[PDB]
RNA sequence: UUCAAAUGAGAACUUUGAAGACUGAAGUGGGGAAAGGUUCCACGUCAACAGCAGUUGGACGUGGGUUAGUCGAUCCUAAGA
RNA sequence: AUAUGGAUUCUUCACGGUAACGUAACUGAAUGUGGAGACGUCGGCGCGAGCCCUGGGAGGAGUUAUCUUUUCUUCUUAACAGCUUAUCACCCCGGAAUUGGUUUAUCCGGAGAUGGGGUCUUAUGGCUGGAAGAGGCCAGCACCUUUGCUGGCUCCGGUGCGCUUGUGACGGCCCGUGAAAAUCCACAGGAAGGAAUAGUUUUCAUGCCAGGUCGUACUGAUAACCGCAGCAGGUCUCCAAGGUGAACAGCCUCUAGUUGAUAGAAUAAUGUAGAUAAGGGAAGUCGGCAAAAUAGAUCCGUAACUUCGGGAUAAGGAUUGGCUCUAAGGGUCGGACGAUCAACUU
C-alpha cells in the first residue's frame, strides 16, 4: 500500500574536489521537500541520510526521481554550480552528480 | 537474335561498378527485343553461372538495361575480370 | 395539438403557389401517405411506392392500384359491374 | 498532427480508393488502402440472407472449402430452410389432391 | 507464422526432411505478479510457414535443447 | 530586413552562424491526373538571358540517373463508333 | 505435374444435433435454375479507427533575481495466421385482457408476444504468433583509417453533444424509383465408372516448378502546362495541430517552408489609400452621390395587411468585466439510503 522507494545519489566527483558538500545538500532536501502542501511536513514519511559517499532518501508518500532532479537543479543553480556539475542516472533510481565535459 | 545479338555491352559507370562488388549483380546492356527469358538463357550459356533474377528497364536514350543477379555460388567480380572490365 | 389552422400537410409550401393549388394538393397528399389495410393479412400496413404500386410491409405482397390511393371509385364500380355480369353468365 | 498521402496512382476519392490510417512499428502514420466489403448470399425465393454460408467476395469462394459454402440438407446452399418446408408441403398436398381427383 | 502447443508435434516438425534451421530466443519477462522468469521460444523454419513453441519452464527448455535432432542447424539468439 | 565571417579580381543580392519577421493545416506545407520532355543529380563555367547586380540560376558545357507474379495498362462492358 | 500422410468403402460413394445447424476430408455428365459482381438523395441515432485532451512512472533538455512536485520532449507495433467476439436473422418449450414488450423518432404480438434455453454471418474489436532480434530514448568507453563497442529503459490508465472518416439498423422524398458485361460460386437433375486389394480422394494437411510485354526520373504552378514572354490571368483532386469564438470567419502560435519583388538620401505643392474635428445639422447638389450611423448574445415587447402559411430580427426599451459563493441537472457498486467517480450547461 505504501511500498517505500529508495533514492541514492553519488556526490563524490565534486565533493573530493572542494566544490561540493553533502551536509548542506541533505539539509536543503530535508527542509524543502513538500508533502501534501508546503514544506516542513515530514512526519515520519520521508527520511534523508547523508554519508559523504552517498545520499539516501526514503519516502512513503508521493515522490519520484524527477522531483529529486528538480530540487537538485534548484540547489545547484542557487550555489552557482551549473555549467560544472550535471545530474545523471546510472540504474533505475540510482543517480550521480557527474561533471560537464571539462 | 543470337546470343551475340542479345548481350550487347557491359555498363562501366562507377555507380554500376559498385553493384558487382556489394550486391553481386552484373549490369548489362541488351537489345530492345530481348526478354527476361532470353537474357537469363544467354548469360547462363555464355558464362556458365546460376542466375537468380533479371530486372530490365528501357532507358531514355533508347536502349535497354539489365540487372542480372547471381546466386551465392559465384562471384561477379571474378566474372567481370574474366570478361576483362573491372 | 393543431399547430396550423387549415393548411395541414401543405404547410411546407409556405406562401407560394397560390391558395387553390395548395388546397388541391392537400387532398391527394393526405391520400398518398396514409396506411391502408392489407386484405390477405388483416393488418394495416399497406404503403405506396412508385405511383401505382402499393406494397405490404409484412406479407411481402404487391398490388396495382391508383396513383394516390389504393383503389379508386372508377375501378370499384368496374369490379361491381363485372361481379354483376358474373352470375348472368354462370347460369 | 502528421499528414498522409494516397499510395497508388489514382488521386481521387472513388469507391475503390478508400484509406485507413495506421501506425507502423516505425513510429509514423501511414495510409493503407482497404478493400470493398462483402454481401451475404440471399434466398432464391425468400430474398433473405442465408445462415451458415460465409460472407466473402465472389472470387474468394474459389479458395474456401466446401463446408463454408453449404449446409447439410436438400437445397443446402441456395434456399432458405423455411422456403423449403413450404415447397415440400406444397408438393405433397398437390400430389394428394391429384390422387383424390383421379379417384373421384 | 503459426504456433504449436503440444511438444510431440514440435519434435515431429523438426524432422520433416524440409526444415533445415531453427532458432532459440531467450526473453526476460515477468509473471505479472512478482518474479522475472526466462521464457524461451523455439522457432523452426518450414518452407511456406514458420512454426513457434513457447516454454516458460527452464528445465523443459533445457530438455528440448538436449533432445533436438542432431542434424538440424540451430541459431542460438 | 540587420550583424560578422568565408569565397572571389570584384559582394545590398552567393554560403555558413546569430538575431528580427511572415505563410498560420481552405498553407508560401506533403502527394498525384492531364500536359511538358531531361527541366532531376554531380562537376565546371559567365559571351548572351533571368527589365539593378551576380561568384547565383529551370541558363551554358560535360557526364550519371527510372529495377515489379502482388501498383497501373493489358481483360470487361456503358453512351457511341 | 504429381508423391508422402490422412479420411471413405466388403452396406461401394462419412458422421452428429429434436431444430436453427456443425466438421479437416467425405465422387457427380448433358441440360435447368439461383446468388454475388450490382448500385439514388437527405436526417438524426448507435458502434469502431486515427487525431485532439489528460493522470502515475522511467530517462533527457529549458528557466530559476523571486515563484513553480514546474515547461517541453521519448515511452511504437505492419500485411498475414489460429482461438474468440454483436446489432439483425433463425430454432425449441410455452400460451398472452388485468393488454404487454419497446425506439431520440411508434411500431410489434394467437400468421404465437413478453420469458427461459440455443444456432449463424465476423464488419469491428480482444489475445497469442509475426516481434523486439526491429525502431525510439539514454549512459559509458576509442580515434591524423572514410569506420565501431558494451550496457540499460521502452510500463499502467481516464474522458467526450470533440474533429476526420468507415460502417449498422431505421425514418423521409419522387407524375424522378435511381447501369451493363466479363468473372466466381452453389443448387436441382442422376450419365458414367470404381471399390476390400485396391481404389476414391488434388475442394483435408504438407511437399515441387513457374509467373512474360509496356509505364516507373522531376514539376504540377505569382518561373516547369495554356496565354506572342519567365505575363499579379486561366485549369481537376487527397491529407490537414492548439487558443478565442456558434463556426473550415477574422486575429495569434507549434511541425514544415520562405525571407522572393532594383537600392540609397531627404520629407515641397499635387495624386492615391486611411483617419480625427468646435457650433450648426442637407442651408450643398439635377438628385443625401460619396461618407456617418446600426450590428453578437440574453430579457420585456411587437402594428396595418394577409392566399392564414406569413409580415417579424417588425417597430420600441433594458443588460453584458473580474472575483468569492449558492441551487438544479448523472454513472457504478451493497438489498429508504451508504460509499465512491465524471462532465459542461442554465
Ligand atoms: Zn399483407
| Phi, psi dihedral angles at C73 (to 5 degrees) | -55, -40
Total structural domains within chain D = 2
- Which position has the grid cell 383421379? D102
- Range of the structural domain that residue D64 is part of: 38-104
Q: What are the residue ranges spanned by the domains of chain E?
A: 1-77
Q: Which long-range contacts (CB under 8 A, 24 or more apart) does D73-81 make?
A: D77/D41, D77/D50, D77/D53, D78/D44, D79/D43, D79/D44, D79/D45, D79/D46, D80/D43, D80/D44, D80/D45, D80/D46, D80/D48, D80/D50, D81/D51
List bases, strand F, within 7 Å of protein CB: 25, 29-33, 38, 63-68, 71-72
| D66 and D47 housed in the same domain | yes
E26: left (phi over 0), alpha (psi -120 to 50) or beta: beta
| D42 and D23 housed in the same domain | no
| D27 and D44 housed in the same domain | no
**Cα gap B34→B75, rounded to integer Å:** 25
Residue D43, burial from CB neighbour count under 10 angstroms (0-12, 13-18, 19+): middle
| D67 and D78 housed in the same domain | yes
Q: Provide DSSP, D44-91.
A: SSS-SB-SSPPP--TGGGGSS-SGGG--SSTTTTTS-SSTTHHHHHHH
Residue D54, burial from CB neighbour count under 10 angstroms (0-12, 13-18, 19+): middle
**Cα gap A57→E4, rounded to integer Å:** 49
| D64 and D84 housed in the same domain | yes
- Which position has the grid cell 395539438? C1
D46 strand G contact, CB < 7 Å = no
- Which position has the grid cell 561498378? B17
Residue C28 CA to ligand 1 center (angstroms) comes to: 24
| D52 and D98 housed in the same domain | yes
Query: Nearest-CA neighbor of A85 among A8, A9, A27?
Result: A9
Resolution for this model in angstroms, one decimal place? 3.1
First to last CA, chain B: 27
**Cα gap E37→E28, rounded to integer Å:** 6
Query: Nearest-CA neighbor of C74 among C65, C85, C62?
Result: C65
β-partners of residue D42 are D49
| D66 and D19 housed in the same domain | no
**Cα gap B64→B28, rounded to integer Å:** 9
| D60 and D103 housed in the same domain | yes
Beta strands in chain C (DSSP E): 46-48, 53-56, 62-64
Please, are residues D15 and D37 in contact by the beta-carbon 8 Å criterion?
A: no
**CA C64 / C1′ G144 distance in Å:** 100
Q: Which nucleotide is nearest to D12 (CA to C1')?
A: G237
Contacts with B14 (C-beta within 8 Å, 6 or more apart), sequence order = none
**CA C76 / C1′ G317 distance in Å:** 66
First to last CA, chain C: 58
Please name the chains neighbouring A, where neighbouring means 3+ C-beta pairs under 8 angstroms.
none
Give, as one character, the DSSP assignment of residue A1.
-
**Cα gap D58→D33, rounded to integer Å:** 20
| D9 and D29 housed in the same domain | yes
Contacts with B40 (C-beta within 8 Å, 6 or more apart), sequence order = B51, B54, B68
**CA E32 / C1′ G332 distance in Å:** 27
Experimental method, per PDB record = cryo-EM
HSE-up of residue C91 (Cα within 13 Å, Cβ side): 0
Tell me the residues surrounding ligand 1 (ion) with CB < 5 Å: C 38, 41, 56, 59, 61
Amino acid at each position: 500500500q505504501k511500498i517505500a522507494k529508495t533514492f541514492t545519489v553519488d556526490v563524490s566527483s565534486p565533493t573530493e574536489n572542494g566544490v561540493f558538500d553533502p551536509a548542506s545538500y541533505a539539509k536543503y532536501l530535508i527542509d524543502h521537500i513538500k508533502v501534501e502542501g508546503a514544506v516542513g511536513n515530514l512526519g515520519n514519511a520521508v527520511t534523508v541520510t547523508e554519508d559523504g559517499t552517498v545520499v539516501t532518501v526514503v519516502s512513503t508518500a508521493k515522490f519520484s526521481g524527477k522531483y529529486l532532479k528538480y530540487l537538485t537543479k534548484k540547489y545547484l543553480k542557487k550555489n552557482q554550480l551549473r555549467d560544472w556539475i550535471r545530474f545523471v542516472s546510472t540504474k533505475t533510481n540510482e543517480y550521480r552528480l557527474a561533471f560537464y565535459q571539462v | 537474335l543470337d546470343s551475340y545479338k542479345v548481350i550487347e555491352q557491359p555498363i562501366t559507370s562507377e555507380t554500376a561498378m559498385k553493384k558487382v562488388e556489394d550486391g553481386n549483380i552484373l549490369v548489362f546492356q541488351v537489345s530492345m527485343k530481348a526478354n527476361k527469358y532470353q537474357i537469363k538463357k544467354a548469360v547462363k550459356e555464355l558464362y556458365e553461372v546460376d542466375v537468380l533474377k533479371v530486372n530490365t528497364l528501357v532507358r531514355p536514350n533508347g536502349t535497354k538495361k539489365a540487372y542480372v543477379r547471381l546466386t551465392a555460388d559465384y562471384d561477379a567480380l571474378d566474372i567481370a575480370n574474366r570478361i576483362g572490365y573491372i | 395539438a393543431k399547430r396550423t389552422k387549415k393548411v395541414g400537410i401543405t404547410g411546407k409550401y409556405g406562401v407560394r403557389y397560390g391558395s387553390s393549388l395548395r388546397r388541391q394538393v392537400k387532398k391527394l397528399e393526405i391520400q398518398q401517405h396514409a396506411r391502408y389495410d392489407c386484405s390477405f393479412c388483416g393488418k394495416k400496413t399497406v404503403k405506396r411506392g412508385a405511383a401505382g404500386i402499393w406494397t405490404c410491409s409484412c406479407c411481402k405482397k404487391t398490388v396495382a392500384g391508383g396513383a394516390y390511393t389504393v383503389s379508386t371509385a372508377a375501378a370499384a364500380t368496374v369490379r361491381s359491374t363485372i361481379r354483376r355480369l358474373r352470375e348472368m353468365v354462370e347460369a | 498532427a502528421q499528414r498522409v498521402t494516397f499510395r497508388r496512382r489514382n488521386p481521387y476519392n472513388t469507391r475503390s480508393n478508400k484509406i485507413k490510417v495506421v501506425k507502423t512499428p516505425g513510429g509514423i502514420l501511414r495510409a493503407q488502402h482497404v478493400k470493398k466489403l462483402a454481401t451475404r448470399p440471399k434466398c432464391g425465393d425468400c430474398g433473405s440472407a442465408l445462415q451458415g454460408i460465409s460472407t466473402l467476395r465472389p472470387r474468394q469462394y474459389a479458395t474456401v472449402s466446401k463446408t463454408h459454402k453449404t449446409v447439410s440438407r436438400a437445397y443446402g446452399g441456395s434456399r432458405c430452410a423455411n422456403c423449403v418446408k413450404e415447397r415440400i408441403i406444397r408438393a405433397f398436398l398437390i400430389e394428394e389432391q391429384k390422387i383424390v381427383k383421379k379417384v373421384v | 507464422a503459426r504456433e504449436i502447443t503440444d511438444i510431440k508435434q514440435f519434435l515431429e516438425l523438426t524432422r520433416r526432411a524440409d526444415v533445415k534451421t531453427a532458432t532459440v530466443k531467450i526473453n526476460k519477462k515477468l509473471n505479472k505478479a512478482g518474479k522475472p522468469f526466462r521464457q524461451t521460444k523455439f522457432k523452426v523454419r518450414g518452407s511456406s510457414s514458420l512454426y513457434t513453441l513457447v516454454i516458460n519452464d527452464a528445465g523443459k527448455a533445457k530438455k528440448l535443447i538436449q533432445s533436438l535432432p542432431p542434424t538440424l542447424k540451430v541459431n542460438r539468439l
